[PDB]
């Protein structure tokens, strides 16, 4: 008595596995994207209390509540996985420590180098 392996079966299943594996696609949330807006400037959303009681509120507060506000940077991480399709590339200010470009350089006779 010896153990005989099912090469036919094993190879058949492995080919299927590989084929399936290398055929995948992205997935995005529905509810999430149903409550967000993408713009050139950044993500957009609504303010809470819109549908709530607004009796004890001034005009200034009402106006702001009726408005929109950008999504905080702390929450962007979620989107990475939630909304792979939709990607927002942040663009911060330049960071250059070159003394040559500084205003001080103008008073100097020449440039450092």
């Amino acid at each position: 008595y010896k153990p005989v392996i099912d090469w036919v079966k094993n190879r058949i299943n492995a080919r299927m596995r590989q084929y399936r594996k290398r055929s995948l696609k992205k997935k995005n949330h529905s509810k999430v994207i149903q409550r967000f807006k993408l713009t050139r400037f950044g993500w957009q959303r609504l303010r809470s209390g819109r549908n709530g009681e607004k009796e004890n509120l001034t005009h200034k507060q009402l106006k702001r509540t009726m408005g929109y506000t950008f999504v905080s940077r702390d929450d962007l991480w979620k989107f990475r996985f939630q909304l792979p399709s939709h990607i927002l590339r942040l663009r911060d200010a330049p960071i250059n420590r070159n003394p040559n470009i500084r205003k001080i350089r103008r008073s100097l006779p020449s440039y450092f180098g």
Binding site: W7, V8, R11, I12, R15, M16, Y19, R20, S23
Partner: protein, 228 residues
Amino acid sequence: SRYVKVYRKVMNLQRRKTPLPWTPTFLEFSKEPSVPFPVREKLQPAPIDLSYYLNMEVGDLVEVLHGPDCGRQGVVLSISKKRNTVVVDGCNMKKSFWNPGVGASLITQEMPIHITNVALLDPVVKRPTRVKRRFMMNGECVRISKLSGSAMPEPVSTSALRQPNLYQEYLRQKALGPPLKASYARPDPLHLKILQRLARHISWGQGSPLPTAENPRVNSPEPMALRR
């Protein structure tokens, strides 16, 4: 289910006769290597020629056991040993095609049948039986049936069973291509001969000018000089 597609795809490979022909082009590579080969088992019983053992000869009378032709008698036309198959007249007709010749627009042809699906009829009894060979003192071979114990009749002559194969003719015609144009089909030997004559002057002329009415002459061919 979300696995049918892949399943089928995988299965197809089995039937696939990999590798397949592939013509080359400019800056192009083949993909045949990337095609997995089919899976097969080696250890299996060796083949056998059932035709030889059953004492079944071309032109013999047989009857269909199963299939659409539950009871139908015929004459064996062809036997294939490697496939273990036989061809019986007036039975199992499924292969249809366009008429390659004179007649109707459609013609059918008989298809091969497994040897196992047929049996030899008894001479007198007219029932499926077995046949055994017996050798005489003189070396004469006689085929004797089991049921009746009687001698079998001789086979039909091949000249009578010879028939044309129109399926092959249709395949040969298809291999060439679509039908030719009427205009193009028309012969023109008068101008074809002039073109053929000009072809030799162009090829074996060595750049020599063609003959003219005022100068009907042409430079002779030059031989291959040896390296002294």
